[PDB]
Each structure stands twice: as C-alpha cells, then as structure tokens.
Point group: C3
Chain length 396, copies 3
C-alpha cells in the first residue's frame, strides 16, 4: 500500500511556532509530529511513504527525513493532485496526531473506498459525516451551522484512483475552494464508501494550544518513568518523570509529575517543575524558576526568577531574569488568542503565551495572557507585552 | 449578669478590611475577635450575651453567631451612648466595647460582683488618643477626659463597664447634638458626680482594633501567647522548622520550605515548595503560599493566595485575595521614618518603621505589580500587570 | 630601603566606588588593596614605608593605616611626577604606583639590591593603554613611550621603580602645563640618556585597578590563588557546597542554599534560605543574601544587603547598599557585543560580553528596580520602586 501524508499547508494558524518550522516538525516530547505518523504507518507494514509539502518547505523536509519521498505540491484536493499512485492509496492529513494504528491497518485491506470517522464535541468546525442506513457514507457536510451528528471526517482515507476522475469534475464551493471532500462526495454517489469509526485519541494540531494538548496526552500515555540523567541529593520527585540522558537535576529541585526532561537539560538548583512540564531538549531551568503545563522547545533557557505556565515556547529562546507570563484573566473567562487575524477563544481558562524561535526577553519583562511573540523578536527590559509582537519586532 | 457588646460603629478607620466584614469578625489566628470576647465573658459564668450592631450589619452577625442575641441600634444617633440605648436590662449590666481584645477575664469576673458602678482602667503609652481617667483621692472615678492634648495620666478608659440602670437617666440628660452623637463617657461623667464609680486597674494585655496595623499587633500577641506548637497537617521531608509553628488540619507543607517561628498555618493551607515563612506569619485559613514566596509579619486572611515569586512583609491581606506572580510589597521608606497611612482622610503615622500594605477582600493583582509602603487597596480592586501602586486604590477600582 | 606608595590621584576612573573611599581601600576579598602592597614590601624586609595621598584623602588614610607615614602631595600639580616631589629620601627609594596589585615580591626584593636605577616591565595584551618600554641592545631602558597608537612591543612600564635621588634633577628639567601634568616617566626618559636604567621583566600576576571592572578581575584572581577552603561559620543541613568556598567567622548559611565555588563569604554574613551563590561570588563582610537571591561573579562590599528575589551578575556593589525586593541587574546586551561604560565622560568598552552594574556606597533601590548593563549608580542615590535605570545616576540622585 502506498501512503501519502498531506503536509502542504502554510501553518499560519500555528504561528509563531511555524515562523521557523513546518507544522510536521512540531515536537511531541522528543520527536516531531511526522515521525509518529510514519512510525504508526510502518506498524501496519507500510514502507512506501510520501510526504506532499509546499515549495518553500521542501528543503527542510529533505534535511530531516531519511527514507521518505518528498514531493512538492505543483487545499487537500490540490495536495493529492501530486500523489502518484495507480490503484489505491492511504491518505492522511499531516496535521493529525492519532494514538491508534489498527483502524488504518484494517482500512488498507479493504477493496472498497473507505474513510475514518471520529466523534468530537465541536462538529461545527469540521466535515460532518452523514451515513446512509447501511452505515456507509452518504455525504460529508463541511462546517454545518446546525450539525446533524458528532461524527466527523478524521482526515484518514483509503481511496482508489477513481478519486482523480471525481477531482476533475469539481468546481464549487461557496467558500471559494476545491477541497478533497467535494470529490469524495461525488465518489460516494457511485460507490460504496465505508466508514470505520475511530475510538482512540485523535487531535488535529490546528492552533497553538493544541501543541500543549497533544504533549500532555503523549506524556500521560506514551512514556514511563525513567532516569538516564544525574539527579543530585535533595531533589524531590513525585509521580511520573522522564529524565533523558545527560540531563542534570540540581539539589532543591522539586518535581510534581508528569514531567518530561529532555536530553542534556540542566535543572536547578531550587527549580519547581509542575505537572505537564515538557522540556524538549537541552533546556536550562534555573533557580527560583517555576514551570507548569508548558512545552519548552530545543535549546531554550529560563535561567532566573521566572514563572512559565500554560505556554508554548519555541526553540532557542532566552528569558531574561524576572520575565513572567500571565496565564489568567481577572474575570476568569476563557483566554482569547489572535489566530489568522480573528480573535477567538482558546477554550482555556488558563493560558499563557506563544513565543517564537530565537526570541530574547530582557530582564523584568511582563507578558499578558494569550499573547503571541513572533520569532526573532526582542522584548526590552521592563516592557509590558500587552499585544502580539511581530516577527523580528523590537518591542520597547 | 447580662452582658452587652457594643459593635455598632461603621469601622471606617479599619478600611479596607471593613469593606467586606464588620470589625467584630476580624480574624485573630483562626477565630473572629468577637468569639474571644464571648469566650472570656463565659469564663466568668455569663450566659446572656447580646451584641448591638448597625442595621446594615445585622444579617452578617446572625449568620455568624449561634446562641447570642443580636439587637440593632434602633437608629439614628451615632456613638456608644446611642448603642446602649438599645440595651434592655433592669438593674445592672456588663458592657464592653466591641473593638477590644483583652487577655484577662478575672477583672471582669470581679467587677460583676460589685454593687456599685465600676469601670476598668488600663495604662497605655499614648493616652492622648483615648479617654483619660482622673481619680479622686479615694481612687474612685472623678472624670474621663476624652483625648486631652496634655494628658494628666497614663490611665485610660479600657471600654469595660459594669453599670446600673441609673445610666439611662444620665444618658437622657446629655444634649443631642446637631452632629447626632451621644458618648457613653459623657453619661458616666454625670453619674460619677452623684455615685461612687469604682476603677479596677487592668494589668494584662489590652488592645483596641482601631487602625489596620492593630490587626498585626493583636495577631502577634495571640501567636506569642495563646497557642503552642502543633502539627495536624502533612509536612514533607526537607522542611526546616525553627521555634513555634502551629499547623492546623489538612495543611500541606512541601519540601524546601523554611519556617522561622512563630508562625500560624491555618487549616487546609498549601505551602511550598521552597517557600519562606518568617516570624509572625499568620495564614488564617486555606492559604496558598507557593515557590519563591516569602512572608513576614503579616496577616493573610481566608482563602488568599500568593502563589509565585512574591514578598509580603508587614501587611494585612484580606479574604479571597490573589497575587499575580512577582507582586511585591514595599515596607520601608528610603529615609527610614515612620510609614504614614490615610485613615478617614487624615494622613497619620502608623507608629511603624516597617509597614507594608492593607489589601481588601477579593482584590486581584496582575503579574509584576509593585505596591508602596502604607498603601490601602480597596476591596474588589484590580491592579493591572506591571503597575506601580503609589497611592490608595478605591473600592472596585481598576488601577492601570 | 625607603618605599613610597603613590596614591594621590582623584580615582575618578573608578567611580562610583571612589565616591566614598580612596582607590587604595578597594577590597580584595577581606582586605584593602594597599594592605597587600604593604605586606609584600615587608616580605622584602622593607619597614620604612610612606604613602603619598591627596589633601582630601589624608584623614581617611590616617584612620585606616597604623605604622605607615602618610604625606600629602604638597604641590597643587597633578601626576606621578608631582607625587614624588613630596617623597623625602637622600640616596635611593623604591617607588610603587598605588593602583597596582601584584602577586610576586621577589622582583622588588632583587631591584632594591641594585646600585643602578631600575624599573619593572610587564607584558600585557593591551600595550596601547600604557607606557611601552623600548629597550636598547644591552636590554636596558632606551625610553618609555606613553600610550603609543602603534605599540612597538608588549612590554610595558609596570609602575614599580627603584630610583636614585638624581631623579629630582631630571624632574626639575621637565615641562607641565596643566592638562598635561608632571609625569614621572618623562623624568625617567631624561635619566635613561645619562644612566644605565635596568629593566627586570615581571612574569607573575599584575593588574592595575584603573576601571571598575578591574575590581572584579583582581578579586577573581585573589579567590583563585590566595585562599583555600575553610569553614569558620555555621552551615545548616541541606546546604550544598561544590568546589572551593571560604566561610569566615560568624557567617551563617541556611538550609536550601546552593554554592558553586569558588566563593568567598565574609565575616558575619547571613545567607539563605534558598540562596544561590555562583562562581566568583565575593561577599566582603557582613553581607545579607536572602531567599531566592542569586549572585554570580560579583564583588559585594561591607554591610551590603540583597534580601529578596534578586539576581546580581558581573557587578560591583559598594558598601552599605540595600536592594529592595525584585531588584534585577541586566548583564548582557541583546547583540551580545561588549558592554560599554562611561568612564571620565568617555564611552568605552569594558572588554566584557557579560557585565552588570557598578553601584556606589549607601545606595538604596526600591522594590522591582531594573538596572541595565554597564550602568553606574553614584553613592547615596535612591532608585524609586519600579524604575528602569537606563543611564548613569549621579551622586545623591533620586532617580524616579
């Protein structure tokens, strides 16, 4: 079976993380999203895997990925136009994290066309599956204002080469787009499209807080207590902690699991790591530094007198002493974030900041809830960051 | 003996604490001021205790007090004279001011056995601020001089009386009052002309809770004198405890916490890791004190949380307060002189070289807030991240 | 042999440290610079030592120094030539610049046995900033070129001379006038034409204390080379000590403190709980370092206190300083280039990528103060709570 990972979006909704990396390389603990997808495909015996990517990202993917074909897109309909297969293929959206491979292993043994459905609490935001009374696909309704069902399109398809025929027929939509689901809808009129319901953990990494979501799940479900580092005396560890090689934890550090401490990290003295602290790799967490429910990416340093809660901090970031993130509004309502120029609810009462790569903060910087700081920004000592900060912006 | 507690003042001097509670319910360790008063009255065998309160506070007192009569000051005159106008007794009663904390009950037990009228006197260092007792040469009361500019004596009116129903006769003589005030002491002065008013001098600890810093005063004394080392909580390893520490039930103290007594840790509190509790830290109940948080000589009331990277010194923080990370209180002027506080619109000295802030109930501070010495923050205020609070903040004010 | 220490400069380049002390009394660990110089002279058998000082500093020197002659630079002419005009000797004398720290005494012990005039040369990496020695082909002194734009050599004038009374004759021949002062080296240049001036090259550690960062330089060297692990204080349990730590008498170190040597903890200091002392922390005497306070590569002078929630890196803090809670020093520029400092009104490079602040005596910072890299704060300054100190602050200035 050939497999195609569709990873050709701009990743705009995931800014500022995607200022410096494609969505497919967002870390989940110590490894990129796309390595999970590949690994799970391979458990099903699939060997021939291709990723479809944008022109601008091709080189990044080639650097990172060894024995995987990388093809540039020449929407999801547009992406599969660059998929070269004769009979049938497995197609997965590249923004998905999924815990289970067996549904995929099943669907690649079917002769018929098939898709995966999953139940979500917000079907409004997705393609909703309407089933006929043999429980095969009737149609996919993109983002219905009144959703007839909880069952959505999971973004996992086993499609026959007949899909190209249906792709050629499509013009549409009212939202000014081609799609992939439009072609499936035409296919379902003439063919029986099976729907396999998916019961495991499923998340699309659409918005920056979803990085926290999947990292928490991974930490809860995919790893187990380990210590390959050096823990000094007077370190207190409760619950599940993963300590990778070369990580150093100094006296007075206090850890309430679950916590992930990546390779080469340097912690303490007198640090406090709270549940769902994910330190991806080579992180510096220093004295009187407290971290909670945050993803802190490769090489980033929080050396002195700082609190990082409910945040995503990208790679190579440095926080001057006394940089603080606010994670709660005064009125305790859900924290709003600007995502592609729309102000939307994160769904979280507690939410900190999203900080791009190579950011530097001066000493005594104050960051407000839900704020995005673009890659390469500088925040000047003492500043109150009360809005989004642009790529490379020097905030004074 | 009937007893009356006079608790019908506005409590304005005690703002912002009294924005959300009557003075009688100011905590002293884990219990309100009035419960001490009631408990000490009961040690003398008194059972019939009434509290006289304002109309607006009646419901609050009823909620809080079980087997105590609550009577409203049947308006509409202010002062202690007006308050005892609602006290219903036939012959004699024990009367105490509801702003007082007193360590000793035995002077009270004595005075309720006397047939004569009697009052308690106590020696203070600042008699200028009080009613001074002038004694005749049989050491009975001559007169009470309210706030004399040149005080003839250290002996003041302690606000504890055993008075006969004749006081009502003298109260009726006293001229009300464009200002709508009636002072009980004016009636006692008329009574002392015609009767022998005995004066029992009180040698124990006595304090009135007049200004917000007096909340620290009495809490300190209580911690020093009324409670003893106890641990009903859960103390992790690598907790360092020196001197006297009271840990109530369900309190959790995490590793790295360092405690220099005397310290009171109220029920359900959550401390540490890596907290520092200095002498005269009083955590009333269900308090959160987190990592890199230091507290010294402060009263932190019910449910209040100081979760990260903060220093709280010489302060009173009321109920349900939340300090954003990095909120700091200044407690010392650069010139090291006494810290001044605005009390009923007058700028006065606290009498303290070290004094922090007084924070009302339900306040929220943003991250990185800076609060200056002697500042009052009204209940329900919100302080915006990074603000420098260099003046008093109003009730419900959003300070930016 | 008579010896003269020339300590009569204004010390302006070392402001703000020299706002309250002469350069001679800058501490190196627990003792002033000049006590090292005296001690090393005495290892050579020298007993008759005189210090030449300014009129304004005479009394300070007399208070501090016991059995040492103190002479004021009479002449109101500035420079080293002017200074030795007040040196009274008949035949020969050892002359040392009072800004020098030197590890070795044996070069001095040799040079005082020579009949000829002699000077000490040392190799430095920045000869541009000093008098460069040009040697003749017998390796004697040809001439000293003050601050040559193109330096012909690494060998500079170390500021250590054994000169004969003939130097006064050459001093009388030389100009002034008065930018533009009387330089001792100009007289040595005339002397070298008529006499053989020997040059002994110095291979040990040599530093002049010219700019405020040099206080860090020499303290680091002293800590690395002159002292060894010791504990005369009281260390509580759960203190972690790595590498070399000197703890002087009466110092107290509280639980949770973490120390990465080398570190000097001076007498009577009070550390912790939960403090972090990083390499090259020098706490000269009676210092307070409190909870959640981190120090690295800094010299903190007598009686100075950093009690809460502060980071002090790559800094010099003078005597009797108090940092309000949450005072932070920045020690790195965003562009990672060398930190610049204003020194006598010229903006120059410190030569350091990491450099914090230089803080004068008796400074007080309010809570939550932010100090930028390379900033100087004059003695007696006050910094208002929440201020961002982004320029130099004057002597006694109230920065708001």
């Amino acid at each position: 079976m050939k497999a195609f990972i569709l990873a050709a979006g701009s990743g705009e909704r995931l800014e500022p993380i995607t200022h410096t990396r494609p969505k497919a390389f967002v870390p989940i603990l110590s490894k990129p999203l796309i390595e999970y997808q590949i690994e799970y495909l391979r458990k099903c015996g699939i060997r021939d895997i291709t990723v479809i990517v944008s022109s601008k990202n091709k080189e990044y993917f080639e650097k990172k990925l060894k024995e995987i074909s990388i093809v540039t897109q020449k929407g999801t309909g547009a992406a599969i136009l660059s998929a070269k297969f004769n009979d049938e293929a497995l197609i997965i959206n590249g923004d998905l994290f999924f815990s289970n491979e067996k549904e995929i292993c099943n669907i690649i043994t079917l002769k018929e066309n098939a898709i995966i459905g999953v139940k979500v609490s917000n079907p409004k935001d997705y393609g909703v599956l309407v089933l006929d009374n043999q429980n095969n696909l009737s149609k996919i309704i993109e983002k219905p204002e009144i959703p007839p069902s909880n069952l959505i399109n999971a973004g996992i398809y086993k499609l026959n080469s007949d899909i190209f025929t249906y792709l050629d027929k499509i013009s549409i939509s009212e939202r000014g787009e081609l799609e992939l689901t439009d072609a499936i809808n035409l296919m379902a009129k003439d063919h029986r499209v099976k729907v396999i319901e998916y019961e495991g953990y499923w998340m699309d990494i659409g918005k920056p807080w979803n990085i926290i979501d999947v990292n928490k799940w991974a930490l809860d479900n995919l790893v187990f207590s380990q210590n390959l580092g050096n823990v000094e005396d007077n370190v207190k560890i409760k619950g599940k902690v993963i300590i990778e090689e070369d990580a150093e934890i100094k006296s007075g550090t206090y850890i309430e699991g679950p916590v992930y401490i990546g390779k080469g990290s340097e912690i303490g003295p007198n640090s406090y790591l709270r549940p769902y602290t994910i330190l991806v790799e080579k992180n510096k967490i220093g004295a009187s530094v407290e971290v909670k429910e945050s993803v802190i990416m490769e090489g980033s340093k929080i050396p002195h007198l700082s609190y990082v809660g409910d945040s995503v901090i990208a790679e190579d970031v440095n926080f001057g002493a006394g940089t603080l993130i606010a994670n709660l509004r005064f009125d305790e309502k859900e924290v709003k974030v600007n995502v592609k120029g729309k102000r939307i609810s994160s769904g979280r009462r507690k939410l900190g900041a999203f900080i791009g790569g190579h950011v530097r903060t001066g000493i005594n910087v104050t960051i407000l809830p839900g704020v995005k700081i673009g890659a390469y920004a500088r925040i000047y000592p003492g500043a109150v960051v009360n809005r989004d900060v642009g790529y490379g912006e020097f905030f004074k």
